[PDB]
Amino acid sequence: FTYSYLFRMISHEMKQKADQKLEQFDITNEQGHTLGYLYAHQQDGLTQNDIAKALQRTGPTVSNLLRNLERKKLIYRYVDAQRRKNIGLTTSGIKLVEAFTSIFDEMEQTLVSQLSEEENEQMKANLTKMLSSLQ
Amino acid sequence: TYSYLFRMISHEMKQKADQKLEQFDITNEQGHTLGYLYAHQQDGLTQNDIAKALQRTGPTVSNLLRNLERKKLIYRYVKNIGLTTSGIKLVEAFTSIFDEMEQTLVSQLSEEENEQMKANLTKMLSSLQ
Numbered sequence: 001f002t003y004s005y006l007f008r009m010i011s012h013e014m015k016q017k018a019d020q021k022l023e024q025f026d027i028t029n030e031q032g033h034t035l036g037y038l039y040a041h042q043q044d045g046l047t048q049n050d051i052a053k054a055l056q057r058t059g060p061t062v063s064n065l066l067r068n069l070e071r072k073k074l075i076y077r078y079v080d081a082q083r084r085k086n087i088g089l090t091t092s093g094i095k096l097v098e099a100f101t102s103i104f105d106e107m108e109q110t111l112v113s114q115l116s117e118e119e120n121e122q123m124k125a126n127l128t129k130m131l132s133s134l135q
Numbered sequence: 136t137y138s139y140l141f142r143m144i145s146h147e148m149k150q151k152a153d154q155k156l157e158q159f160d161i162t163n164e165q166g167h168t169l170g171y172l173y174a175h176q177q178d179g180l181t182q183n184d185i186a187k188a189l190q191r192t193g194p195t196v197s198n199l200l201r202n203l204e205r206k207k208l209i210y211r212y213v214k215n216i217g218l219t220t221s222g223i224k225l226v227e228a229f230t231s232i233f234d235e236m237e238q239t240l241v242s243q244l245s246e247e248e249n250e251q252m253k254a255n256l257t258k259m260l261s262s263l264q
Contacts, residue, residue, distance in 0.1 A: 003240045004148055004233060006256045011145040013263040014138065104138065111137045114262045115255055126244060126252050127140045133243050134147035 003130070014107070021103045025096060030057070032100070034065055038075065038089050039097040045086040069093075137259070148236070155232040159225065164191075166229065168199050169208065172218045173226045179215040 019029045027035070037054055038046060052062040066087060069075045074093035077085045089097070112120055156166055171188055172180065186196045200216060203209045208222040218226070241249055 001253070002233070002237050003253075003256075004237060006253065006260065007141065007144050007148055010256065010260050010263065011141050013260065014141060017263060108136050108138055111259055111262065114259055119251075119255055122248075122251065123255050124137075124140070126248060127137075127144065129243055130240055131140060131144050131147065133240065134144065134151050 017107065018104065021107070022100055025100055027096070027100070030055070031065060031069060034062075034069065035074065035089070035093065035097050036101075038087060039094065042089055045080065047080075047084045047086060049084075051087065151236055152232060155235065156229070159228065161225075164195075165199055165203060168196070168203065169218065169222060169226050170229070172209065172216065173223065176218055179217075181215060185216065 015029070019032075022029065022032050033055060034051060037051060041050075048059065048062055048066060051066070052059050055062065057065075066075065066077075070077075073090055074096060075087055075089055077087050080086055115123060153163055156163065161169070167189060168185065171185060175184075175188070182193065182196050182200065185200075186193055189196065200209060200211075203222075204211070207219055208225060210217050210219055244252060
């Protein structure tokens with residue numbers, strides 16, 4: 001009945017559904033954020049350390065994740081010419097990020113199709129006001 | 136998008152909770168310790184008991200308890216750790232944080248906007264199973 005219970009149960013359930021979707025590509029939640037992160041910043045060169053930071057996880061944890069992604073050849077790496085290893089997405093890696101990026105859009109549409117046009121509009125405005133009141 | 140909004144809100148809700156908690160001069164970890172003691176006092180807890188239930192190291196708990204004891208929120212006897220009356224009263228007071236936050240949000244919308252808002256969220260939550 002409370003907004004705290006509703007907001008948290010939804011977020012929880014949304015993550016549960018999204019991860020459910022990502023596992024059909026045999027990708028975990030964290031592997032998903034890593035891949036997505038690389039897809040959004042492959043323009044200049046990311047190091048294992050950059051990923052660990054933005055991801056807020058330990059080097060050895062990140063190292064083991066890149067290795068797993070690496071064996072599938074979804075990423076590759078080259079030493080920087082300017083003592084650090086840059087990580088890059090492979091073509092299949094880009095296709096995979098594009099494939100499950102469409103699934104997330106699909107989830108957003110399913111949620112929307114749950115309310116009428118007017119209800120969606122009001123819901124979005126009200127969620128915004130509440131998001132501000134807390135900020 | 137709903138995904139973005141629901142994640143940002145859950146993030147801010149969490150912070151708001153901590154911010155209010157800090158108004159009692161209590162950290163999140165300190166709050167959990169007190170709460171743990173509040174619900175598991177009946178038999179007598181040692182630092183070890185607290186550390187394992189909280190999944191924290193001996194020094195962390197040792198530090199937490201020391202901070203708490205200097206405020207007389209807890210006490211110890213031959214060593215079991217117990218919650219004092221002010222400690223129990225403080226833990227009960229934590230409830231106002233959830234209530235205050237619920238009302239602050241509610242007061243953002245009209246009475247009907249709230250019923251609509253809550254019914255729609257319930258629907259969305261169901262579609263999510």
